[PDB]
Amino acid sequence: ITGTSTVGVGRGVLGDQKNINTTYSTYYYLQDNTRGDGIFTYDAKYRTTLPGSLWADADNQFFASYDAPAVDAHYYAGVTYDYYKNVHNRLSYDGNNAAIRSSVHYSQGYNNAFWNGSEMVYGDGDGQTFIPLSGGIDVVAHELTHAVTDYTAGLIYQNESGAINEAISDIFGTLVEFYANKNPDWEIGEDVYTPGISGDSLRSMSDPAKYGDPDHYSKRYTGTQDNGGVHINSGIINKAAYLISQGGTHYGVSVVGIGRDKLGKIFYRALTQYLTPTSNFSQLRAAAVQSATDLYGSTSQEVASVKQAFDAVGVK
Ligand SMILES: CC(C)C[C@H]1CCOCCP(=O)([O-])N[C@@H](CC(C)C)C(=O)N1
Ligand SMILES: [Ca+2]
Ligand SMILES: [Ca+2]
Ligand SMILES: [Ca+2]
Ligand SMILES: [Ca+2]
Ligand SMILES: [Zn+2]
């Protein structure tokens, strides 16, 4: 749409009020012209045909409950765009300011979110297992990071490369959650998962085994479900990433933490410069070491922590 840039206000899935960037042209649309070539949010009106209709509102106030998921998907995508640009100097997912699009209210009772190769899609949840998925900033950033990975390393979605792909999405979704300082943690999806139960989450990076995902290479899943366990085995990389950042002793191997910022610089460089579509865990380790080496010196502590972390999860 062509119109005047403005700012509206609404309430997100969790009931919090926020301002969002809109465009005015007869109606007010969820179209943010301030970032790259724009962020656009669409209503899929409970259908599965995408993208659906660009979200239009009559008065620039988004307090209706049907509005919530759109408010959050639109706002969280802007925060995520900000993280990448500010933190890594990357303009949108393709690095050339591509428009970011998301659709909400996809299908009925859909308990998932995904990147379909061209845009983000968020279900509303069935209200027991999940509430609308765009209310979790770590979920929004996990989705946009799949776009980043597809434009860069291109990790194929199966087996070890696919689990690397998935870990990348959880790691940067968590880093964006800390960037925005939105009650950050090392858990995934806590804010929209099982509304009835407090304290849980979908996956844990600090202790993946809490939910049954592997935290050591010897425990990897070798079957065929989930494309070869991309959502299970990512637990091994997530744990490594958490140790690089926070430090700890795991399986008797001690790691000194180097912090989130460095974790992000190292993984971003590995992703954008060294990983390839078919890279495996052992190649991710070489990539991460080389990146840390590039950035801090081969005799640095940084390099040392990256090695210890992988050794601790059993990746040689
Ligand atoms: C949400 C379900 C239980 C877990 C897996 C389902 C398969 O989803 C594939 C697409 P994705 O981008 O990996 N979606 C992720 C959504 C989370 C972060 C809420 C995911 O882990 N989905
Ligand atoms: Ca309105
Ligand atoms: Ca949190
Ligand atoms: Ca989280
Ligand atoms: Ca819960
Ligand atoms: Zn994913």
Curated annotation (Swiss-Prot):
Domain of life: Bacteria
Binding site for Ca(2+) 2: 138, 177, 185, 187, 190
Residues where Ca(2+) 4 binds: 193-194, 197, 200
Temperature optimum or stability note: Thermostable.
Residues binding Ca(2+) 1: 57, 59, 61
GO molecular function, one term: metalloendopeptidase activity
Cofactor needs: Ca(2+); Zn(2+)
Binding-site list for Zn(2+): 142, 146, 166
EC code(s) of this entry: 3.4.24.27
Active site residues of this protein: 143, 231 (proton donor)
Reactions that this protein is recorded to catalyse: Preferential cleavage: Xaa-|-Leu > Xaa-|-Phe
Residues annotated as binding Ca(2+) 3: 177, 183, 185, 190
EC class name: hydrolase
Record-level GO cellular component terms: extracellular region
BP-aspect Gene Ontology terms: proteolysis
Keywords for the protein's UniProt record, in alphabetical order: Calcium, Hydrolase, Metal-binding, Metalloprotease, Protease, Secreted, Signal, Zinc, Zymogen
Any coiled-coil regions, as ranges: none
Cellular location(s): Secreted
Co-factor: note: Binds 4 Ca(2+) ions per subunit. Binds 1 zinc ion per subunit.
Sequence similarity: Belongs to the peptidase M4 family.
Entry function: Extracellular zinc metalloprotease.
Entry protein name: Thermolysin
Gene name of the encoded protein: npr
Part of the intact protein present: 233 to 548 of 548
